[PDB]
Scaffold this motif. Structure first.
Motif, PDB file in Angstrom:
ATOM      1  N   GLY A   1      38.199  55.547  26.263  1.00  0.00           N
ATOM      2  CA  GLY A   1      39.172  54.495  26.392  1.00  0.00           C
ATOM      3  C   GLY A   1      38.484  53.227  26.829  1.00  0.00           C
ATOM      4  N   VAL A   2      39.133  52.118  26.527  1.00  0.00           N
ATOM      5  CA  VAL A   2      38.661  50.820  26.968  1.00  0.00           C
ATOM      6  C   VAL A   2      39.891  50.007  27.312  1.00  0.00           C
TER       7      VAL A   2
ATOM      8  N   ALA B   1      30.278  54.584  42.274  1.00  0.00           N
ATOM      9  CA  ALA B   1      29.412  53.420  42.416  1.00  0.00           C
ATOM     10  C   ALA B   1      28.080  53.590  41.714  1.00  0.00           C
ATOM     11  CB  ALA B   1      29.172  53.080  43.885  1.00  0.00           C
TER      12      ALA B   1
ATOM     13  N   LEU C   1      33.580  52.533  38.636  1.00  0.00           N
ATOM     14  CA  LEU C   1      34.617  52.080  39.549  1.00  0.00           C
ATOM     15  C   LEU C   1      35.350  53.241  40.186  1.00  0.00           C
ATOM     16  N   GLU C   2      35.386  54.383  39.519  1.00  0.00           N
ATOM     17  CA  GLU C   2      36.188  55.500  39.976  1.00  0.00           C
ATOM     18  C   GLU C   2      35.669  56.752  39.304  1.00  0.00           C
ATOM     19  N   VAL C   3      36.014  57.897  39.862  1.00  0.00           N
ATOM     20  CA  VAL C   3      35.543  59.171  39.348  1.00  0.00           C
ATOM     21  C   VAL C   3      36.634  60.205  39.540  1.00  0.00           C
TER      22      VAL C   3
ATOM     23  N   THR D   1      34.642  43.835  28.165  1.00  0.00           N
ATOM     24  CA  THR D   1      34.579  44.992  27.290  1.00  0.00           C
ATOM     25  C   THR D   1      34.647  44.611  25.820  1.00  0.00           C
TER      26      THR D   1
ATOM     27  N   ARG E   1      40.208  40.014  44.705  1.00  0.00           N
ATOM     28  CA  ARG E   1      41.529  40.222  44.131  1.00  0.00           C
ATOM     29  C   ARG E   1      41.442  40.773  42.720  1.00  0.00           C
ATOM     30  N   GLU E   2      40.563  40.206  41.898  1.00  0.00           N
ATOM     31  CA  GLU E   2      40.446  40.688  40.527  1.00  0.00           C
ATOM     32  C   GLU E   2      40.019  42.145  40.494  1.00  0.00           C
TER      33      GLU E   2
ATOM     34  N   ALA F   1      42.997  44.393  41.546  1.00  0.00           N
ATOM     35  CA  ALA F   1      43.955  44.522  40.457  1.00  0.00           C
ATOM     36  C   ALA F   1      43.401  45.376  39.326  1.00  0.00           C
ATOM     37  CB  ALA F   1      44.341  43.146  39.931  1.00  0.00           C
TER      38      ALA F   1
ATOM     39  N   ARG G   1      50.171  37.602  50.412  1.00  0.00           N
ATOM     40  CA  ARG G   1      49.802  36.455  49.583  1.00  0.00           C
ATOM     41  C   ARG G   1      48.983  36.868  48.366  1.00  0.00           C
ATOM     42  N   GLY G   2      49.161  38.102  47.908  1.00  0.00           N
ATOM     43  CA  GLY G   2      48.502  38.565  46.711  1.00  0.00           C
ATOM     44  C   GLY G   2      47.123  39.143  46.917  1.00  0.00           C
TER      45      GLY G   2
END
Lengths: 169, 184, 57, 459, 600, 459, 116
Positions: free
Chosen positions: D14-15, D31, D49-51, D64, D261-262, D265, D274-275
């Motif tokens: 997936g992308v 990481a 980023l995750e596993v 990407t 923040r990016e 998200a 405040r986000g």
């Protein structure tokens, strides 16, 4: 005074810029020496490859290292044409050791269809059955994976340790 | 790793481009190899064309660092020839003398930032006058511009652009006033 | 005129220092090169295959 | 050392935005760094980023775009991100991920350090003590920085906080009443400002001391996340191992928090206040608190975060949390800037909670604290008198109030105002302070002890 | 080869059997071949933004698979064209379908293949000569203003094997043909570039030359520069119209590109109506501005995906002419309405939002758009340096200054001409908030000023100082009253009013102030600041003395001088010469000196 | 044409608020139309909001009460919503979905048009320059309408936006020195409002030109998604094909936006500000942007939506996005209405972006633009002074501020305040504007050039 | 007994084979034995909020289940001590590891067993 300061300011810029280029020039010479060393290492590895007796043991190591890293049930070893008998022997010896150390059954084929490029110094590339996962145990790959980790020790050995570095943690 | 923002592949293709372009600019300004000092100053980049090669051969040499391959230095050295070529071409009916041409070249090479130079500005103004005339119709405006710019080309041939010759300054100012004045 | 002149001397000075440093670097490399190379090639040749330390069964 | 050879997967499953999902990964690390080859030969790094199980979600540094299943390959580098550190990188300019962009060589590592580092043991940290002089009188005299303090230069968008940062970089150094180093780190700095930094440090001779990291406004925001950590890892090497006092100037921590923040998200966490992410406090703390002196090592790390305060709102999460973690504040002020004072450092709201350690005999000079207090008092009284003048009229003013108005004028015009390329030692800033305090007869300098007034005031 | 539609939810079409489809590739959805762009992948299922209304697409519809990312055609034909957000030429669609509607899935080519462009090869090129990316291998006489320098595409290279002789050629004709490592590449006059990929440059350079708009406020207090990045609010009576059209009619820009990201329908119909009517003086001949302008119309009702791609298409055309070597200038009518497309698309894709709902990558997207600005050393052999100024209007809800698009913009743009609603309501045009607007290019431009207008920088500093002092004093004046002011304060107020009404105020619709050359602007400011200096000199010198001078005396003593200082704005370069205007302003300075010397 | 039999599925798989999820549908077509036979014979209509494989998510216009799985029969019409249109739609009253409720027969199609409407080429959209003399001075003098402008009347709950819209409808006509057909889309208007509009259109004898699409408050709340699209499709048929000049009124775009919100929540889309769908801007643009002229055609569509601003917050998403899309808003103000000033038009927050090119020599008069600007400026300053007067009291105000306050009072009394049945020609509105400007001396009218001051001021 | 890491997303680790784990029990994740707190269970899995940086944890890493919730070790040796909030003794970490950093996943006994 302002005009004289213009001349002095230009002198400052010129001296600064010249010194900076000199610094980068020395650092690039050092990088060039290191590159020379690694090219020499590659040539020496080619010389080793010429000698079958040690090369056979080296392949026995690399093939089994690929098998251990993949741990798949069906696997395909890709080697240079020149090396095929040696890689055949390596796979034949590796399969039993794989079985014993991993307890898994395994099927290892050698890709006679498409050998590695003849320019490659040596080593093997082990793909899994569907060829979506590849472990690249060619000698150039290993030499790179080793030198990049060795650089600290290479810098220390070649250009003398850093005397400012009092503590190592 | 990127060099100058260009991927090293593009960087070395650009180096080969500058080499070929300097070859072309020399072949244009001086087919009879009269400009010997300039020839010697550009021997290192010219050699790769004075001896025939494949593009990929020169690219391999550059990627190996055998060629002159500092793109900034090449850009400077090419710009000097390019501005000299513009000087000689934009006065083509009044081609100037070899020693004067070499003096122009030497002054330009010495200039700190040629592109931003008054030497380049004067060439731009001469081109502004000249290019307008390559298709202008017969009318008093265009006839006056043709005469005034032809004498301007003559004066450029005589005194180069390093000299802030007053005659040339006057010709520029008046020719540009005439160009800017409305046709009516 | 002094500014035009003295910067040539400064350029000569800085290039001289650069040449000295490059020579020292090249000398040290040409001295330690053999013992670095033998170690590096020995480390390349010493394979030591191992399964991932998390492997089960 | 890692001997085993790397696994390269074509198993992209997936992308989805900036993430590439690979499956059938063997024992993924979190990481872990990845080098993935696009179909067309291009190469892009990524961070796992995750596993989960056999899956790995790789945040590709560059977009990407152009990635696909079935043809994109993805080499797993088998280790977390590590920065090569040496003294050689003192006097270099790097992009956000350690790649040189000064056309020098790739760094020949003295070591490989994990850029997350570890927190300094609070029982090994020491109090900052002596001063780091920045040359900018408005902070050397009135807001001095002790070796190991973290003090942020608040500034609104448009104010010359970048120019002030450059001046600090070019001028800073020990008080010299030569083992000093600087680590500049620009996050989210637009191309013109980055070029300003690079060429300014190159031109003004300071490059010998300065290692400059640049994350252009259009470089990957993950490279923005890891730039402050690269900066601080080099600072820890140069300070706690090379034993040389480092000054870390992190620039536009607001542009860093936007990258945070990016990345949040992208992880698909829900926003906090405040986000911004909820953990922004811990993260900004992890960046800032890699500072201060440590027992048994003669180096240190000073920090000067620089903040673009959105809407000029001092309550905004970035400045609020940065105030919680740091030890002061230096306000770049819009009214001063508009009046065309530089450096527009407004010394009334500015503060340095550890100035009291950086001054005094043996560190700057005997009269530093007294002159700072008196200048602050006279400046504030002068601002008061200037507010009153327009109400009561000039001829209703008393002679003392006229003295205070003159002092206000000359403090904003001779002391605060410095010009970008004027370097004033702390001693010179103090003597300018005295030249201003002599506007008053001694009896008005009530916060200066007589033992100091009698020694310094005359002449 | 080609997949099949599998779901449809507005402009998002999930498509199965897209096994190898590459991210951001272009696909042709539906039986009408709507254009679409892959925005995600899962296994063998892609997800496709569609740039056209999907109502009526059905599951199973073929999804053809073009192997190229969203790309814009660059070649002779751009200048004068009105482009849809994704390069479709609206004028040709009209002339071709002979009706007023845009058919769904209309596939007229971006650049006409029927026109016989006049192509002239670069004379020194030859068979076997080596060329590289960006080389100008020919020039096309596109029109009397722009000579379209045809460039080898970036990422191209090799030895020429055939270079066409001078002649007339179609946009399809093979005009050059070159070989590299034994593979041959045939090049026509039109190239294709992915709009989202930065067009490479040899070297970016500092933006150290001013881009004169028509407004004194902007040219003086907040300069813009060749290749500068700017933000402006979308005001009314000013802003979008005045500045855009003034830069168009006259400025330092050689090409103007416009992009109506989310423009209102009738305002876009205004721009498409005015621009082909405007003209400029060049070499003493009035020539249309569409001979050197291109418009990318994207009205608000056209699809959201196209509303996003409009900005990129515009900026890529601008970068194309930059590479040719021009000082291009781009006006983006609403990056706020662009951020709306980003927000909506993120929501439809089900991503996590951030402040106010915008996708967290808004900052990175705005950076990728703006940072393509600047003055560049173009690629290729013939040395040259173009630029691309960028001016992106913003429109936050109700003028909010925390709006995430405005904030991210402020973090990127080197110039910001913020909006003062109080002035807008007073009808004071331009409505620039000269207290929170800023320009970071002053450091660069001080060199150009010290070479051309050596006196301008101190005038600028004193003008800013005067404006700020008047701002300070008004707060007291409204809270207490004017009685307590000294003569210096009175002169500051009564010169700040002069500046705010007769220098920083410009009627953009009059013949004389449609555009204020810089000699006029610096002359005006010089006269006003000289008046300030000499009035303050008089009162300061005669203070604390019996023969006291006061503003109350000066105003009545030289009421004529103040009238002429106010009237300076009315001088008209179009009929008054530069010499006349300079002489008149110097004569006003002389009169001022005489009046002051007599008062003394 | 479609010769193939329609497929009818008893296969309902879900009912969820306004939605009906089917399954096993053969090749669903997005935006397709569906005829649901409920168990008891009741026949409803719906639109396919999304398709996925074999699934369809119908959106039932007449609501889902009484629908059940296993017996509701959905006939899939095989085509998007194509509505009939005919010129004799003028003088009819249709319910929300375009069915007749005037007891006349269904619309014998002169043609079938897709309610979405085929988009128009910006290169061949004409610019609207002919000013509509609405008669309301608060519009003609200061926010004039041009024939083709999208100019919504923002208003709030309880203000007389209905009266304003009715007055505009019965008074609008070109400037003298072409009689509007009306197309009126009532959405969520209570019976009192619907009957007011209907009775007024009959009272003014206009019924032969009015085509009402009523979707009352008690009518199903998804139908008002397509009611404005029906209205604008009939308007386009009348304008761009029959050549008539059409004035479209849309009674409550806020009721429309709330129907959108209902559907968005039912679909569980990621919601935007205040819960409305993120795509509201695009979906409202497809409604508003169907105004304006077009080349060749002689007709035109003027469009005057009406918005109820919740809590009178003009920053609420509905008014905010409508202000982005439409060419400026007339603004009806509670603070004026509570003072009993009809029409309660507040001229400060209202503008007409096409006014500037729809007024001037030969079109209305030479002084129109200048009078408009000056009245606006004087009104704004008067409001500021009125705010001040509360703080400082009438003693502290200068006589100029008093002039401004008198101008504000007499401006609301003479210029804005207007008989509901009084249509002030643009000339009369301008004279009444000058009557006020002449409160001031000529020196204080800074926005009027000296020529147009001298020509008009003294008379 | 040992569980095994089954996922890592920031500090949130997800561990399989933790059938008996008690909610809000502490676990030592990974080969460096980083501390984590079981904030959720599902089936025989567990979600572990890892206190320390998770960079470098990998699937399959052993999870050693501490038998007790976040707890303090109370006994002689407290007095004069310096503790991190988790009861890590800093005055012993620095002394034993001769470093200015808290080693990631340090496991120094809170109260020295060596001293009589």
């Amino acid at each position: 005074e302002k005009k004289e300061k213009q001349i002095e300011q230009q002198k400052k810029i010129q001296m600064s810029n010249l010194m900076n280029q000199a610094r980068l020039k020395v650092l690039r010479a050092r990088d060039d020496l290191i590159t020379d060393l690694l090219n020499e290492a590659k040539q020496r590895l080619s010389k080793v490859v010429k000698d079958t007796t040690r090369y056979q043991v080296l392949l026995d190591g690399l093939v089994l290292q690929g098998l251990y890293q993949l741990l798949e049930p069906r696997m395909i070893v890709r080697c240079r044409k020149q090396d095929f008998p040696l890689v055949k022997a390596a796979v034949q010896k590796a399969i039993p050791m794989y079985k014993i150390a991993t307890k898994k059954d395994v099927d290892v084929q050698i890709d006679l269809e498409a050998y590695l490029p003849e320019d490659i110094a040596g080593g093997v590339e082990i793909y899994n059955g569907d060829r979506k996962i590849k472990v690249s145990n060619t000698l150039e790959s290993r030499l790179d994976l080793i030198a990049q980790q060795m650089m600290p020790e290479v810098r220390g050995a070649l250009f003398g340790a850093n005397a400012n570095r009092k503590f190592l943690d | 790793i990127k060099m100058g923002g260009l991927t090293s592949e593009q960087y070395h293709s650009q180096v080969v481009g500058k080499i070929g372009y300097i070859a072309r600019c020399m072949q244009t300004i001086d087919p009879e190899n009269n400009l010997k000092k300039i020839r010697e100053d550009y021997q290192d980049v010219l050699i790769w064309a004075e001896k025939n090669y494949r593009f990929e051969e020169i690219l391999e040499a550059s990627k190996s660092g055998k060629c002159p391959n500092d793109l900034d230095a090449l850009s400077r050295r090419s710009l000097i020839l390019q501005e000299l070529l513009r000087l000689v071409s934009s006065i083509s009916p009044f081609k100037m003398k070899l020693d004067l041409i070499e003096s122009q070249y030497e002054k330009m090479k010495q200039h700190v930032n040629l592109w931003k130079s008054d030497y380049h500005v004067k060439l731009n103004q001469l081109n502004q006058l000249t290019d307008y005339l390559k298709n202008a119709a017969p009318t008093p405006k265009n006839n006056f511009l043709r005469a005034m710019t032809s004498v301007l080309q003559m004066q450029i041939a005589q005194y180069g652009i390093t000299e802030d010759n007053e005659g040339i300054n006057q010709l520029f100012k008046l020719g540009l006033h005439l160009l800017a004045m409305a046709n009516e | 005129q002094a500014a035009m002149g003295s910067q040539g001397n400064l350029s000569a000075e800085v290039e001289q220092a650069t040449r000295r440093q490059v020579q020292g670097m090249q000398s040290s490399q040409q001295r330690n090169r053999e013992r670095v190379l033998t170690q590096l090639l020995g480390m390349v040749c010493d394979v030591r295959p191992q399964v991932h330390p998390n492997y089960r069964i | 050392y890692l001997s085993q050879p790397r696994l390269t997967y074509k198993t992209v499953s997936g992308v989805n935005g900036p993430l590439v999902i690979l499956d059938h990964v063997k024992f993924p690390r979190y990481a872990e760094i990845v080098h993935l080859t696009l179909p067309d030969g291009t190469k892009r790094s990524g961070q796992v980023l995750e596993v989960s199980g056999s899956k790995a979600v790789v945040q590709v540094f560059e977009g990407t775009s152009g990635i696909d299943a079935k043809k994109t390959s993805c080499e797993f580098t088998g280790d977390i991100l590590r920065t090569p550190v040496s003294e050689d990188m003192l006097g270099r300019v790097f992009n956000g991920s350690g790649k040189p962009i000064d056309r020098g060589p790739v760094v020949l590592a003295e070591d490989f350090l994990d850029i997350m580092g570890q927190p300094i043991n609070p029982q090994c940290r020491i109090y900052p003590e002596e001063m780091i002089q920045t040359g900018i009188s408005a902070i050397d005299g009135m807001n001095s920085i002790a070796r190991g303090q973290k003090i942020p230069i608040f500034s609104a968008a448009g104010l010359p906080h970048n120019e002030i940062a450059a001046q600090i970089c070019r001028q800073a150094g020990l008080v010299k009443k030569e083992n000093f180093a600087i680590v500049f780190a620009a996050m989210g700095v637009n191309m013109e400002t980055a070029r300003f930094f690079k060429s300014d440090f190159e031109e003004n001779g300071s490059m010998d001391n300065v290692c400059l990291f640049l994350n252009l406004a259009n470089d990957p925001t993950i490279e923005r996340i890891i730039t402050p950590r690269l900066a601080l890892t080099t600072a820890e090497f140069l300070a706690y191992q090379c034993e040389k006092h480092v000054l870390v100037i992190l620039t536009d921590m607001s542009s860093y928090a936007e990258a945070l923040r990016e990345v949040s998200a992208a992880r698909e966490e829900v926003p906090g206040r405040r986000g911004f992410p909820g953990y922004m406090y811990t993260d900004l703390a992890t960046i800032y608190e890699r500072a201060g002196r440590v027992e048994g090592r003669n180096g240190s790390i000073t920090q000067i975060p620089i903040l673009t305060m959105p809407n000029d709102d001092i309550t905004h999460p970035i400045p609020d949390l940065t105030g919680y973690i740091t030890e002061g504040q230096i306000y770049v002020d819009r009214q001063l800037h508009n009046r065309q004072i530089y450096p527009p450092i407004n010394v009334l709201p500015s503060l340095s909670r550890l100035m009291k350690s950086a001054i005094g005999e043996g560190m700057t000079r005997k009269d530093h604290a007294d002159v700072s207090n008196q200048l602050y008092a006279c400046y504030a009284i002068g601002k008061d008198v200037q507010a009153m003048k327009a109400v009561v009229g000039e001829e209703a003013l008393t002679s003392d109030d006229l003295l205070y108005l003159e002092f206000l004028q000359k403090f904003e015009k001779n002391f605060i105002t410095q010009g970008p390329y004027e370097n004033r030692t702390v001693y010179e800033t103090l003597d300018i302070g005295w030249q201003l305090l002599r506007i008053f007869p001694k009896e008005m300098l009530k916060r200066i002890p007589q033992s100091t007034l009698s020694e310094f005031y005359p002449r | 080869t080609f997949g099949y539609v599998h779901g449809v939810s507005g402009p998002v079409v999930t498509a199965c059997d897209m096994a190898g489809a590459a991210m951001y590739e272009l696909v042709r959805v539906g039986h009408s071949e709507l254009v679409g762009e892959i925005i995600r992948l899962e296994g063998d299922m892609a997800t496709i933004q569609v740039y056209e209304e999907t109502s009526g697409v059905s599951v199973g519809d073929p999804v053809l698979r073009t192997g190229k990312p969203l790309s814009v055609e660059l070649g002779p034909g751009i200048m004068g064209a009105i482009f849809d957000g994704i390069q479709r030429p609206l004028s040709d669609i009209s002339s071709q379908t002979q009706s007023i509607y845009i058919p769904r899935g209309v596939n007229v080519s971006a650049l006409s293949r029927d026109i016989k462009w006049e192509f002239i090869p670069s004379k020194n090129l030859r068979v076997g000569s080596h060329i590289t990316g960006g080389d100008i291998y020919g020039i096309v006489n596109e029109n009397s203003l722009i000579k379209h320098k045809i460039m080898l595409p970036p990422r191209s290279r090799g030895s020429v094997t055939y270079i066409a002789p001078p002649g007339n050629y179609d946009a399809s004709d093979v005009v050059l043909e070159l070989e590299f490592e034994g593979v041959k590449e045939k090049l026509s006059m039109v190239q294709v570039w992915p709009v989202r990929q930065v067009r490479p440059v040899t070297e970016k350079l500092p933006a150290n030359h001013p881009l004169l708009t028509g407004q004194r406020v902007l040219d003086a207090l907040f300069p813009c520069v060749q290749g500068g990045t700017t933000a402006i609010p979308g005001a009314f009576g000013c802003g979008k119209t005045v500045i855009s059209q003034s830069l168009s009619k006259y400025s330092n820009s050689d090409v103007i590109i416009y992009v109506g990201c989310g423009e209102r329908g009738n305002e876009m119909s205004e721009v498409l109506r005015d621009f082909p009517e405007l003209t400029m003086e060049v070499d003493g001949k009035v020539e249309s501005i569409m001979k050197r302008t291109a418009l990318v119309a994207n009205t608000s009702n056209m699809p959201v995906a196209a509303r996003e791609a409009s900005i990129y298409t515009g900026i890529t055309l601008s970068e194309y002419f930059r590479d040719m070597g021009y000082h291009v200038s781009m006006m983006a009518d609403s990056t706020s309405r662009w951020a709306e497309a980003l927000r909506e698309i993120s929501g439809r894709l089900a991503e996590m939002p951030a402040d106010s709902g915008y996708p967290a990558y808004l900052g990175a997207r705005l950076a990728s758009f703006y940072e393509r600005a600047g003055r560049v050393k173009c690629l290729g052999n013939p040395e040259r340096e173009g630029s691309v100024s960028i001016v992106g209007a913003v429109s936050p809800p109700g003028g909010d200054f925390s709006d995430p698009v405005t904030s991210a913009t402020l973090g990127i743009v080197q110039v910001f001409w913020g909006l003062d609603k109080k002035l807008a309501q007073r009808k004071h045009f331009p409505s620039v908030n000269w207290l929170i607007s800023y320009s970071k290019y002053m450091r660069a431009l001080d060199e150009y000023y010290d070479k051309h207008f050596t006196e301008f920088v101190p005038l600028r500093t004193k003008a800013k100082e005067i404006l700020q002092e008047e701002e300070d004093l008004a707060e007291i004046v409204q809270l207490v009253g004017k009685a307590s002011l000294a003569e210096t304060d009175k002169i500051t107020l009564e010169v700040a009013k002069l500046i705010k009404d007769d220098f920083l105020q410009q009627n953009g619709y009059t013949p004389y102030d449609r555009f204020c050359p810089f000699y006029k602007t610096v002359g005006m400011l010089s006269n006003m600041i000289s008046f300030y200096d000499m009035a303050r000199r008089a009162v300061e010198t005669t203070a604390q003395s019996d023969n006291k001078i006061t503003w109350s005396i000066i105003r009545e003593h030289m009421g004529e001088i103040l009238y002429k200082l106010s009237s300076m704005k009315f001088k008209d370069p179009v009929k008054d010469g530069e010499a006349k205007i300079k002489a008149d302003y110097a004569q006003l300075l002389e009169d001022m000196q005489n009046a002051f010397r007599s008062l003394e």
